[PDB]
Paper text:
Tae4 cleaves the γ-D-glutamyl-L-meso-diaminopimelic acid amide bond as do Tae1 members; however, it specifically hydrolyzes the acceptor stem of the muropeptides. Moreover, the immunity protein Tai4 represents a new family of T6SS immunity proteins forming a heterotetramer with its cognate effector Tae4.
Crystals of the effector/immunity system Tae4/Tai4 from S. typhimurium readily grew to a size of 400×100×100 µm3 within 3 days in 2-ethoxyethanol containing conditions. Experimental phases were obtained from a Single-wavelength Anomalous Diffraction (SAD) experiment and an initial structure was built and refined to a resolution of 2.3 Å. Native protein crystals of identical crystal symmetry diffracted to a resolution of 1.8 Å at the Swiss Light Source (Villigen, CH), allowing the refinement of a structural model at near atomic resolution. Both models were finally refined to excellent stereochemistry, with 97% of the residues in preferred regions of the Ramachandran plot. The core of the Tae4 effector is formed by a central antiparallel β-sheet flanked by α-helices. In contrast to the Tse1/Tsi1 complex which has been reported to be a heterodimer, we found that the inhibited Tae4/Tai4 protein complex from S. typhimurium forms heterotetramers. In this heterotetrameric assembly, the two polypeptide chains of a Tai4 homodimer inhibit two Tae4 molecules.
Residue numbers in the entry:
A (entry chain B), C (entry chain B): 27 to 127
B (entry chain A), D (entry chain A): 2 to 141, 148 to 161
Write the structure that this text describes.
């Protein structure tokens, strides 16, 4: 199966990059980190934007990846940091602002 | 003109390693981006290394996304950009093959582009070809090649 | 830090559940799977829907989690299955249809 | 009326285990959902077990999401639902404490509800309290309790 990678709009690719890259930050396991890294690079391939936009998405991602989340069940809730991240107003505004459409 | 084949093949070997190692070899912003995990596909970076090393450097104002190495030369990091760059600098391709197979390229050597479907990270690949094998053969199934393109290197 | 969990609308919670649950399916590492499982349960907590809607989201998730994705770099692209999954038309329609708003 | 304290405390202990073990103990749709990983917070499931075991079973047509166990009895799986269920079946609470601490509950035993902020998976918790400790004390910081509520069990 070929993935849906070529079907995404430019801002969808940037949102997809944001999510996968954030997952690459929060998870410790190498196989998982590499997987998320590899997945993010696919969205970078199809982007029309300069590398600095991804650096900036990473700047915003690190404000979530550094958070400590707690619950009444045992977990660091790493996955949730990245889900909270992709709803971030500054992230969506950054993407909407972009110079390279 | 074009990079000599022998110099191109030699240059490619220096960076025919894991993308992490490629980052250590090249350094500068290439290395920083690979260390950060932003670049995972070394294919267009290796091709850039070849052009830079053989006297055909990627121009700074070339209309493709690129980062500098420790050498202060420029490295294109998207496969599609690398392909398009070649189309615009290399002149008329020497072989264009619809639904290609490796046997269509036997007896000729240079820069090969294959475009196809089946990959989730790219529309195709760019590498060197010596008439028998690709320079990154050791790193390379579900990819179905649609078009094969060769620029002969002398 | 408290996560943003209470700020999500009902369909946002279902979308968040879908994503995290899919990540729980595709990754092999226990710590990562547990994390994604724990994260999904948080979105279930705040839902107003019966458990069968999550069972159905899981039915659709398994059509992506079972896919084989390939590339010119070494990876199973597991993360990408789940990103493709959350853009799924049947998933979004299932959520929009829901009886329990 | 209300479950006796002694029977409630005893019942809770049977399911004071990891959520996986709770699923094995209870079986049926509770077990299937825990095996599938759909339920990870055993808190409202344990409370349901207590009510079911002590002669105060959760009614089938109760307006809360629930699944059956192998016993064919019903298990509420959301904390907020479990809290609301108690508010509607237990009568007037015996102690309501704003900004509570454990010392506010000393000398009294029954069903405790704490609601607060700081947790990412829930608005609060429901458990048993024997005048000194909670029944799930071994499973339990960044949670800031806003309201503590106790229904005394005889």
């Amino acid at each position: 199966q070929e993935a849906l990678t070529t079907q995404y709009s430019q801002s969808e690719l940037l949102k997809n990059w944001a999510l996968s890259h954030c997952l690459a930050l929060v998870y410790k396991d190498d196989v998982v980190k590499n997987d998320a890294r590899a997945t993010a690079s696919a969205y970078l391939e199809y982007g029309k934007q300069s590398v600095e936009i991804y650096h900036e998405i990473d700047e915003i991602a690190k404000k979530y990846s550094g958070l400590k989340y707690n619950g009444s069940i045992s977990s660091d809730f790493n996955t949730m940091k990245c889900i909270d991240f992709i709803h971030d107003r500054e992230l969506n505004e950054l993407i909407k602002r972009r110079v390279e459409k | 003109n074009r990079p000599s084949f022998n110099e191109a093949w030699l240059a490619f070997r220096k960076v025919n390693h894991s993308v992490a190692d490629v980052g250590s070899i090249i350094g500068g912003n290439v290395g920083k981006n690979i260390t950060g995990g932003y670049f995972q596909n070394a294919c267009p970076i290796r091709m850039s290394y070849v052009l830079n090393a053989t006297g055909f450097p990627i121009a700074r104002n070339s209309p493709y996304a690129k980062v500098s190495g420790a050498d202060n030369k420029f490295y294109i990091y998207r496969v599609n950009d690398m392909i398009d760059y070649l189309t615009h600098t290399m002149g008329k391709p020497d072989l264009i093959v619809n639904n290609p197979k490796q046997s269509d390229f036997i007896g000729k050597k240079g820069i090969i582009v294959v475009k196809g479907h089946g990959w989730s990270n790219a529309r195709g690949h760019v590498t060197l070809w010596n008439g028998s094998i690709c320079s990154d053969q050791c790193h390379l199934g579900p990819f179905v090649p649609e078009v094969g393109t060769l620029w002969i290197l002398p």
